[PDB]
Structures are given as C-alpha cells and as structure tokens.
Amino acid sequence: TIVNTTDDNFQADVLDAETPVLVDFWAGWCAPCKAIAPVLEDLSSEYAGKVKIVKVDVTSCEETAVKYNIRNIPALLLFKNGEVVAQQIGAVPRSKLVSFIDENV
Amino acid sequence: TIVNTTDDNFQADVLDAETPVLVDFWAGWCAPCKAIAPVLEDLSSEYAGKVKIVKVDVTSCEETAVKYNIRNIPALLLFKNGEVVAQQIGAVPRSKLVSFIDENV
C-alpha cells in the first residue's frame, strides 16, 4: 500500500499521520527515481504498520516540492507527527535505506 | 536570447533548426539547474549564431522530458537536424560545458 498523494491531499496523507511517513519525491523522467520503485515496494511490505510510504510526483506536485525545499530527486523525507525529521537525497542501496529507516523510527 | 519552448513548440524551436541546439531541461525547484543558469546565459552569447540554447521546464513539459529519456535534471541535450547527437546529464563546470559544445559542434 503506497499512496500517491497530491498538493491538496498531503496534509491528510502525510502531515496528519501518526505512523512515521517516508515520502518519495519522483518524476517519470527521473531514471534513478524509477529505479528505486522495486525496493520501495519491498520496504512498504517489510515495514507494514511501522512506516507508511507515500509518493509525490513532482510534475503535478511542484508546490509540494518547493514547500519542502526539495533541491534534487530522488528525495526521501521522513516525517513524524507532521515535521521532517531526516532525509536521504539521491538514490542509495537497499542496505542504506534500511539503515536510514531503522535509526529514525 | 534563450527560448523557452513547450511540448508542442519543441519541433519548431528545436527539431526544425539547422543551427545546433543545446536544450536545457530544468525545473524551478531544482538547485543544480540554478547552479548552471548563469553560465548558460554567458554561453548563449559567446556562441551566438553557432549554437542556439533553448529551455524546457519539465513541470509543464513532462511529455518532452520523458520522450527524450533525459535521466535527471539539469539535462543538456545537443540536437542537430532534429536528432540528439550528445548529452550532458547533471551540472558540470563552464570548462566542461565549453569542451562539450566544441567537441560536438
């Protein structure tokens, strides 16, 4: 279960969540972004109930990208209680994604 | 003298030209796209009449960005007679942009 959110739904899907939320900013022209889709699918299942994964398509969500000072994609921002607590900019291997999630639970 | 094109103006502004065309795929949130904007303005004048520079805002031109497999932004694609002859993906210094232009033009 990976929600695709929108500028209008980001409050409900991300900011209002109590489960920590890993937000994936991607675009269809972004090759490294597309390349981490498989690991994000696996991770969404591995961490079910502990972490919610949400995708932001920056083509239709430019306002959201700007609002959170996205400067480069792939960008993965971890939200807790509606605030950004950590981020991983640029694609990294599964092992670094697993370590990024585990330290910031 | 840098033309901002669209999905539907792309053929007339880029593909139909006989002068070589350097296309910069960019977005407003993208930081390296800002990194290279000044040098692009200088190069548009240094190479006036020899290379035309055109900009594609991927936020409103997703179709073009996907069609040309740009990988990430900023993407600098050199076109000659409507075909891509070389490309530089990511920001690079002035000296590498000059060598990129001259080697393929």
Coordinates of C-alpha atoms in Angstrom, one line a residue:
Chain A
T1 CA 0.0 0.0 0.0
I2 CA 1.9 3.1 -1.3
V3 CA -0.4 6.1 -1.6
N4 CA 0.2 8.6 -4.4
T5 CA -0.6 11.9 -2.8
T6 CA -1.2 15.4 -4.2
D7 CA -0.6 19.0 -3.2
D8 CA -4.2 19.1 -1.8
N9 CA -4.0 15.7 0.0
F10 CA -0.5 16.0 1.5
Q11 CA -2.0 17.3 4.8
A12 CA -4.3 14.3 5.2
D13 CA -1.9 11.6 3.8
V14 CA 1.3 12.8 5.4
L15 CA 1.1 15.6 7.9
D16 CA -1.9 14.1 9.8
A17 CA -0.4 10.6 10.1
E18 CA 0.8 9.2 13.4
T19 CA 2.7 6.4 11.9
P20 CA 6.0 7.7 10.6
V21 CA 5.9 8.5 6.8
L22 CA 8.6 8.1 4.3
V23 CA 7.8 10.4 1.3
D24 CA 9.3 9.6 -2.1
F25 CA 9.6 12.6 -4.4
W26 CA 9.9 11.2 -8.0
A27 CA 9.2 12.0 -11.6
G28 CA 8.5 9.9 -14.7
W29 CA 11.7 11.3 -16.5
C30 CA 13.8 10.6 -13.4
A31 CA 15.7 7.4 -14.0
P32 CA 17.2 6.8 -10.5
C33 CA 13.7 7.5 -9.1
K34 CA 12.1 4.9 -11.2
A35 CA 15.0 2.5 -10.3
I36 CA 14.2 2.6 -6.6
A37 CA 10.5 1.7 -7.1
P38 CA 11.2 -2.0 -6.6
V39 CA 13.0 -1.5 -3.2
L40 CA 10.3 0.9 -2.0
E41 CA 7.6 -1.8 -2.8
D42 CA 9.6 -4.4 -0.8
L43 CA 10.2 -1.9 2.0
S44 CA 6.5 -0.9 2.2
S45 CA 5.6 -4.6 2.9
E46 CA 8.6 -5.2 5.3
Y47 CA 7.7 -2.2 7.4
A48 CA 3.9 -2.5 7.3
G49 CA 2.3 -0.9 10.4
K50 CA 5.7 0.7 11.3
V51 CA 6.2 3.1 8.3
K52 CA 3.8 4.4 5.7
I53 CA 5.4 5.1 2.3
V54 CA 3.9 7.9 0.2
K55 CA 4.9 9.0 -3.3
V56 CA 4.9 12.6 -4.6
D57 CA 5.0 13.0 -8.4
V58 CA 6.8 16.4 -8.7
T59 CA 5.3 17.0 -12.2
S60 CA 1.9 17.6 -10.6
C61 CA 3.2 18.4 -7.1
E62 CA 5.6 21.2 -7.8
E63 CA 4.1 23.3 -5.0
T64 CA 4.8 20.4 -2.5
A65 CA 8.4 20.0 -3.8
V66 CA 9.1 23.7 -3.3
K67 CA 7.3 23.8 0.1
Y68 CA 9.7 21.1 1.5
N69 CA 12.8 22.6 -0.2
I70 CA 13.4 19.6 -2.4
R71 CA 16.5 20.6 -4.4
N72 CA 17.3 17.3 -6.1
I73 CA 15.5 13.9 -6.7
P74 CA 15.4 11.1 -5.7
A75 CA 14.5 12.7 -2.4
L76 CA 13.2 10.7 0.6
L77 CA 11.9 12.7 3.5
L78 CA 10.9 11.0 6.8
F79 CA 8.0 12.7 8.6
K80 CA 6.9 12.2 12.2
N81 CA 3.8 14.0 13.5
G82 CA 3.9 16.4 10.5
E83 CA 7.6 17.5 10.8
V84 CA 10.6 16.4 8.7
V85 CA 13.0 14.6 11.0
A86 CA 15.5 13.1 8.5
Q87 CA 16.1 12.9 4.7
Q88 CA 18.0 10.9 2.2
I89 CA 18.8 12.8 -1.0
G90 CA 19.9 10.9 -4.0
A91 CA 19.4 7.2 -4.6
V92 CA 21.3 4.8 -2.3
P93 CA 21.3 1.0 -2.0
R94 CA 18.7 -1.0 -0.1
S95 CA 21.0 -1.5 2.9
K96 CA 21.4 2.3 3.4
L97 CA 17.6 2.7 3.1
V98 CA 17.1 0.0 5.8
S99 CA 19.6 1.7 8.0
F100 CA 18.0 5.1 7.3
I101 CA 14.6 3.8 8.4
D102 CA 15.8 1.9 11.5
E103 CA 17.7 4.9 13.0
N104 CA 14.8 7.3 12.6
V105 CA 11.8 5.1 13.6
Chain B
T1 CA 18.2 35.0 -26.3
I2 CA 17.3 31.7 -24.6
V3 CA 13.9 30.4 -25.9
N4 CA 11.5 28.8 -23.5
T5 CA 9.8 26.1 -25.6
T6 CA 6.7 23.8 -24.9
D7 CA 5.7 20.3 -25.7
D8 CA 4.1 21.5 -28.9
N9 CA 6.6 24.2 -29.9
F10 CA 9.5 21.8 -29.5
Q11 CA 9.6 20.7 -33.1
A12 CA 9.7 24.3 -34.4
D13 CA 12.1 25.6 -31.7
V14 CA 14.5 22.7 -31.7
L15 CA 13.8 19.9 -34.1
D16 CA 13.4 22.1 -37.2
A17 CA 16.5 24.2 -36.7
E18 CA 19.7 23.9 -38.8
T19 CA 21.8 25.6 -36.2
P20 CA 22.8 23.1 -33.5
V21 CA 20.5 23.4 -30.4
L22 CA 21.5 22.9 -26.8
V23 CA 18.4 22.1 -24.8
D24 CA 18.4 22.6 -21.0
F25 CA 15.8 20.5 -19.2
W26 CA 15.2 22.3 -15.9
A27 CA 12.6 22.9 -13.1
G28 CA 12.0 25.7 -10.6
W29 CA 12.7 23.6 -7.5
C30 CA 15.9 22.1 -8.9
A31 CA 19.0 23.5 -7.3
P32 CA 21.7 22.5 -9.9
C33 CA 19.5 24.0 -12.6
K34 CA 20.1 27.3 -10.8
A35 CA 23.8 26.3 -10.5
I36 CA 24.2 26.4 -14.3
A37 CA 21.8 29.2 -15.3
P38 CA 24.5 32.0 -15.3
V39 CA 27.0 30.1 -17.4
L40 CA 24.2 29.2 -19.9
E41 CA 23.4 32.9 -20.3
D42 CA 27.1 33.6 -21.0
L43 CA 27.4 30.7 -23.5
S44 CA 24.2 31.8 -25.4
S45 CA 26.1 35.0 -26.3
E46 CA 29.6 33.5 -26.7
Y47 CA 28.1 31.1 -29.3
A48 CA 25.5 33.4 -30.9
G49 CA 24.9 32.2 -34.5
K50 CA 26.7 29.0 -33.8
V51 CA 24.6 27.2 -31.1
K52 CA 21.1 28.1 -30.1
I53 CA 20.1 27.5 -26.4
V54 CA 16.5 26.5 -25.5
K55 CA 14.9 25.7 -22.2
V56 CA 12.3 23.1 -21.3
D57 CA 10.5 23.4 -18.0
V58 CA 9.8 19.8 -17.2
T59 CA 7.0 20.7 -14.8
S60 CA 4.8 21.7 -17.9
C61 CA 6.7 19.6 -20.5
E62 CA 6.7 16.1 -18.9
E63 CA 5.9 14.6 -22.3
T64 CA 9.1 16.0 -23.9
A65 CA 11.3 15.1 -20.9
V66 CA 10.0 11.5 -21.0
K67 CA 10.3 11.3 -24.8
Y68 CA 14.0 12.1 -24.7
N69 CA 15.0 9.9 -21.8
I70 CA 16.7 12.8 -20.0
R71 CA 17.6 10.7 -16.9
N72 CA 17.6 13.7 -14.4
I73 CA 17.7 17.5 -14.4
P74 CA 19.5 19.5 -15.4
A75 CA 19.8 17.7 -18.6
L76 CA 21.7 19.3 -21.5
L77 CA 20.9 17.7 -24.9
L78 CA 22.6 18.8 -28.1
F79 CA 20.4 18.5 -31.2
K80 CA 21.5 18.7 -34.8
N81 CA 18.9 18.3 -37.6
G82 CA 16.3 17.0 -35.2
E83 CA 18.4 14.3 -33.6
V84 CA 20.3 14.1 -30.3
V85 CA 24.0 13.9 -31.0
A86 CA 25.4 14.2 -27.5
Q87 CA 24.2 14.9 -23.9
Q88 CA 25.4 16.0 -20.5
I89 CA 23.3 14.9 -17.6
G90 CA 23.8 16.9 -14.4
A91 CA 25.5 20.2 -13.7
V92 CA 29.2 20.5 -14.8
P93 CA 31.6 23.4 -14.7
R94 CA 31.9 26.0 -17.5
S95 CA 35.1 24.4 -18.8
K96 CA 33.4 21.1 -19.3
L97 CA 30.4 22.8 -21.0
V98 CA 32.8 24.6 -23.4
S99 CA 34.6 21.3 -24.2
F100 CA 31.2 19.6 -24.6
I101 CA 29.9 22.3 -27.0
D102 CA 33.2 22.4 -29.1
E103 CA 33.7 18.7 -29.3
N104 CA 30.2 18.1 -30.8
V105 CA 30.0 21.5 -32.7

